[PDB]
Design a binder for this molecule. Structure first.
Ligand SMILES: O=N[O-]
Ligand SMILES: O=N[O-]
Length: 251
């Protein structure tokens, strides 16, 4: 008896087999918003593993990455004409959810945001995200930027599976850049009763708060996606319920 989850859509997936244990509106399209950053970090993770970029490179911060372009949204607080290290931009993306850092990495990886988006969709396709399409590296709204809870689950799973060095970064609780400290918004990282080590948080303006989470217990690993909860407390509680049910499902 799957429990009731106060969310517009969700999916709970066994990480090992990829089997869906429970779901609601699993394949219905939504605006993923800041969860789009998981795809950005996925592409960055592949580039780092293959050696096309190094964590020690100095990245140019262009006009397009200027903090000035992202008023009202989360930022790492990067400045034009300076350089920032790849590892630092990565954490800005993952921990701080900084849109500025997304654009800077996009450019460092593929020259322009558009080409970076080409790599994002080519990876989405090879991962089996058949109901997803990206238009930018950060998630700000666009009619053609969409995904689904199920696809987002595949993405979370792929992060843990294919880019572990990138995935480890999702359990870091905070990050400081330029004397500005920001916390990882995934509150489940602080829960002592559970071993939640990811993944990413976000908000979709007409729907609500979202969370893509993963946790382990014994030899089990689950990936859960909850979309459209009414507030940050519900985002945590409903994800925790979803996950506990999965741990109990295998019994
Ligand atoms: O802690 N998640 O809102
Ligand atoms: O079969 N152990 O998750």
């Amino acid at each position: 008896d799957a429990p009731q989850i106060a969310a517009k859509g969700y999916v709970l997936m066994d990480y090992h087999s990829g089997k869906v244990l429970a779901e609601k509106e699993m394949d219905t399209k939504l605006s993923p918003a800041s969860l789009t950053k998981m795809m950005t970090s996925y592409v960055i993770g592949q580039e780092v593993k293959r050696g096309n970029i190094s964590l020690n490179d100095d990245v140019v911060i262009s006009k397009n990455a200027w903090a000035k372009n992202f008023p009202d949204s989360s930022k790492m607080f990067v400045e034009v004409g300076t350089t920032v290290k790849v590892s630092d931009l990565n954490r800005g993306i993952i921990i701080q959810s900084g849109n500025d850092a997304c654009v800077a990495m996009a450019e460092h990886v593929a020259g322009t945001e558009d080409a970076f988006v080409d790599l994002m969709n080519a990876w989405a396709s090879s991962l089996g995200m058949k109901n997803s399409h990206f238009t930018n590296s950060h998630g700000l709204d666009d009619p053609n930027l969409y995904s689904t809870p199920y696809d987002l689950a595949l993405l979370g799973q792929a992060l843990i599976r294919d880019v572990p060095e990138e995935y480890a970064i999702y359990s870091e609780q905070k990050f400081t850049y330029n004397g500005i400290t920001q916390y990882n918004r995934n509150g489940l990282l602080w829960d002592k009763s559970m071993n939640v080590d990811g993944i990413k948080t976000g908000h979709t303006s007409g729907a609500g708060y979202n969370l893509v989470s993963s946790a382990t217990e014994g030899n089990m690993r689950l990936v859960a996606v909850v979309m459209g909860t009414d507030n940050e407390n519900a985002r945590k509680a409903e994800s925790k319920k979803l996950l506990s049910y999965g741990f109990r499902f295998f019994e």
